[PDB]
Amino acid sequence: ALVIAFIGKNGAVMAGDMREITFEGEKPDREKLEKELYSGSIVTDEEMQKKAEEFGVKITVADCKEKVSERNGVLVGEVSSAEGGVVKKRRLYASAGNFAIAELINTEMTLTSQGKGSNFIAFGNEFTKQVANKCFKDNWTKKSNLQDAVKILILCMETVARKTASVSKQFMIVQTASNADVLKVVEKDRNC
Amino acid sequence: ALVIAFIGKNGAVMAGDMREITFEGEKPDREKLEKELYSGSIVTDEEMQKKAEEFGVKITVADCKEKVSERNGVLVGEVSSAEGGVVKKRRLYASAGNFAIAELINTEMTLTSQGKGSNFIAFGNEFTKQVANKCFKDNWTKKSNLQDAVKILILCMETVARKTASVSKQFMIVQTASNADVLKVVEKDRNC
Structure with missing residues (x-):
């Protein structure tokens, strides 16, 4: 962050x-998703989760x-x-x-x-x-x-x-x- | 602890x-060693490390x-x-x-x-x-x-x-x- x-x-x-973020799911996928958030491509958290079930990740936050x-x-x-x-x-x-x-x-x-x-x-x-x-x-x-x-x-x-x-x-x-x-x-x- | x-x-x-303890090495071994410390069998830290190279574990502490x-x-x-x-x-x-x-x-x-x-x-x-x-x-x-x-x-x-x-x-x-x-x-x- x-x-x-x-x-x-x-x-x-x-x-x-x-903010800390927990990543669960296909680890090859995790680095596939992680790219996109790090690169900065999304902001809204609803537009955050969207992509997640596209790729297979459950993502607890606090x-x-x-x-x-x-x-x-x-x-x-x-x-x-x-x-x-x-x-x-x-x-x-x-x-x-x-x-x-x-x-x-x-x-x-x-x-x-x-x-x-x-x-x-x-x-x-x-x-x-x-x-x-x-x-x-x-x-x-x-x-x-x-x-x-x-x-x-x-x-x-x-x-x-x-x-x-x-x-x-x-x-x-x-x-x-x-x-x-x-x-x-x-x-x-x-x-x- | x-x-x-x-x-x-x-x-x-x-x-x-x-005290927190870090366990590195054969995970089946780790639960083999972990037994003995939890069960309480040693106190001196020199008598701690002794056993470790017997079983294959590196154990950073702080x-x-x-x-x-x-x-x-x-x-x-x-x-x-x-x-x-x-x-x-x-x-x-x-x-x-x-x-x-x-x-x-x-x-x-x-x-x-x-x-x-x-x-x-x-x-x-x-x-x-x-x-x-x-x-x-x-x-x-x-x-x-x-x-x-x-x-x-x-x-x-x-x-x-x-x-x-x-x-x-x-x-x-x-x-x-x-x-x-x-x-x-x-x-x-x-x-x-």
């Missing part, structure tokens, strides 16, 4: 949809996976793009000026990026990630601090609330005052 | 170990699954006794005087018990559940309110901290003042 964060001197903003959490002045988000055997997670930590992104298999944690400074990020299905990328330039100028960007995230969250079905229509957003050096959280998660 | 709660007029106490949580004056605990395809959860809600236990498959939530009044409960592997049952009578008299029982849980938590390896040596305990009518939490989880 999608979740997004922004990092700067003032603060950090992380917004995430709460728009309340808590895709971001606020552990201690750092905001954590995470996409469970599971696909089959077990677990395929993919998580971020952010604060004011500090930021990193990690890829999880099951228990195992693998990093992919870090550092300090200023950034805008998202994770998703290919399409959802693209639509956030549209909107962030849309409404973003360096002539903002946090405060505008916080609204930006909502429009973008609406924008793909609007134009898609892989993303829970309810969504949750959290903020930090703190330049917490997010680096530690990852080591604690690894000992865990 | 194990987690335990006590319910009375004053309050509720829920204590849970944080003693920090958050087996209980405090959502709003009600304490929730949950054993993920997964065994294979997907998810086999099993959860409780408790407060001061009110209590219920639900069985989860994946998304789906099934109840098994409810009501109001006074109780002592646990979930686990067969052995761990038994050892808590020992200890609760050990140190329990109706001539207690909460306050003793809160310590009881620790000894029992130590007692199977002690005498077993399926249970994380670190553990977490939470308490409520409130006779919150735990009933609505199950319905909220179902809409979710």
Whole structure:
């Protein structure tokens, strides 16, 4: 689906949809259907289920996976793009000026990026990630601090609330005052 | 593994170990090994791994699954006794005087018990559940309110901290003042 964060001197903003989707049926079919939703081709949920009995899939939903959490002045988000055997997670930590992104298999944690400074990020299905990328330039100028960007995230969250079905229509957003050096959280998660 | 709660007029106490265990290898073997740990036959973790290369299993661990949580004056605990395809959860809600236990498959939530009044409960592997049952009578008299029982849980938590390896040596305990009518939490989880 999608979740997004922004990092700067003032603060950090992380917004995430709460939708998780369960796929049951011919696994070759599942990757045949999965294509179409990821590619972004439908939005209405009635136009979602339509196709499903065309291909053979039963698809339980609940728009309340808590895709971001606020552990201690750092905001954590995470996409469970599971696909089959077990677990395929993919998580971020952010604060004011500090930021990193990690890829999880099951228990195992693998990093992919870090550092300090200023950034805008998202994770998703290919399409959802693209639509956030549209909107962030849309409404973003360096002539903002946090405060505008916080609204930006909502429009973008609406924008793909609007134009898609892989993303829970309810969504949750959290903020930090703190330049917490997010680096530690990852080591604690690894000992865990 | 194990987690335990006590319910009375004053309050509720829920204590849970944080250990989750990952099983990799010949699935027929896994149920062959799983027997022995559940039955309770080992405690030291070096005497844990020993047997594993005897049978062919790689077993990643982390003693920090958050087996209980405090959502709003009600304490929730949950054993993920997964065994294979997907998810086999099993959860409780408790407060001061009110209590219920639900069985989860994946998304789906099934109840098994409810009501109001006074109780002592646990979930686990067969052995761990038994050892808590020992200890609760050990140190329990109706001539207690909460306050003793809160310590009881620790000894029992130590007692199977002690005498077993399926249970994380670190553990977490939470308490409520409130006779919150735990009933609505199950319905909220179902809409979710």
